[PDB]
Point group: C4
């Protein structure tokens, strides 16, 4: 993953009970672009947390998973009013959680959810 | 909030277990317009209650929240057959309940749900 | 109700836990028309039961309810590929169950669900 | 069923708690075509399993059921971007599980879900 330094695992981080794309948010620097606010609720938590991920960051995850896993183990990835990416990335995440455990709980997926730089509110 | 005198808080009013937009209803005075019937179920209640809110009243809530909260903490607000406002206001409410607790349980949101003038069946 | 002789009440019949429109089915006599197969699961039952209702029969129910109840207490009623009536009648039923108890459990609604002539498989 | 040798029954195989179409997957031999990855969770299982079924294989199931069962006991069957078959086959499966028990738990349905040749990962 080209956006997280360390690699993390659901061991240290906590399993995911709920995820979704909560909203999308407009940026400025370094160029105009939408970023997706991802809502995560872990096991044992009542307050959700939120991380920030661009479309090109969702895509990288799916491309990296697809190196490790046969495609049939992965949900379809989708190819502004084009906040249909919000709905589509949401489906993508929901399906990801319903994939066999070797995918849903692998270290890439965990790392994708680990709070970064930006995510420190 | 330009439509409720007092300000209320989930302290005195009771936490929300379920909300949605139940239907929309056609008015007359002082001018033709649709009003949204919002269905609320509190904790400890089995019978829901219903309040009446216009689109311009949902909008004010979102604008007032957006003064207090960074935008990324809030769900997207949407810009008759145009009862797509019903579906859209419904999503908006569902997302609002899934926002971090400092938004979902703030006094504005509580006040928006407090029964007014009209709401006394 | 112009299609059930007696009037029935959730007293004698059993409360509804689940309803939906399950499929729609093509008829012949006395003229070509679609009829809706409504799936009902009562409290205390594990096997659902099924009754048969035409669109004009859903409509009558809504019109009769609207004599008794102010409109804001009722879900919107919708104005073949036109099996969007299935999706729409389904929403209508789901909302009906979420209406205040004086509507959701009134004798008209109960009677609408009581097995008729046709419904004896 | 023209694609499973033996016939199986939920007796030996285990009842279904969750099914859905998880993704669709592109094939090559013997000709270009999409195949549907069906996600099944049995009672007593936490890890789902996955079988592979073409559209013409879903259709055969529905046609064979329709020999045994009156049509009103069956959900509507639907008549690439045409991965609307995924959404549509998914609805079809969800409805199938909600059909009366004599359909939802018959040996054809069970057999449709029994892991074949291909399904051995």
């Amino acid at each position: 993953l080209s956006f997280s330094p360390k690699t993390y695992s659901f061991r240290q981080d906590g399993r995911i009970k709920e995820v979704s794309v909560f909203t999308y948010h407009k940026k400025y620097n370094p160029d105009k672009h939408y970023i997706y606010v991802v809502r995560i609720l872990r096991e044992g938590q009542i307050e959700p947390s939120f991380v920030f991920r661009t479309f090109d960051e969702f895509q990288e995850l799916h491309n990296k998973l697809s190196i490790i896993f046969p495609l049939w183990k992965l949900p379809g990835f989708p190819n502004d009013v084009a906040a249909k990416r919000k709905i589509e990335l949401n489906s993508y995440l929901q399906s990801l959680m319903n994939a066999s455990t070797d995918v849903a709980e692998c270290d890439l997926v965990c790392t994708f959810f680990h709070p970064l730089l930006r995510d420190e509110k």
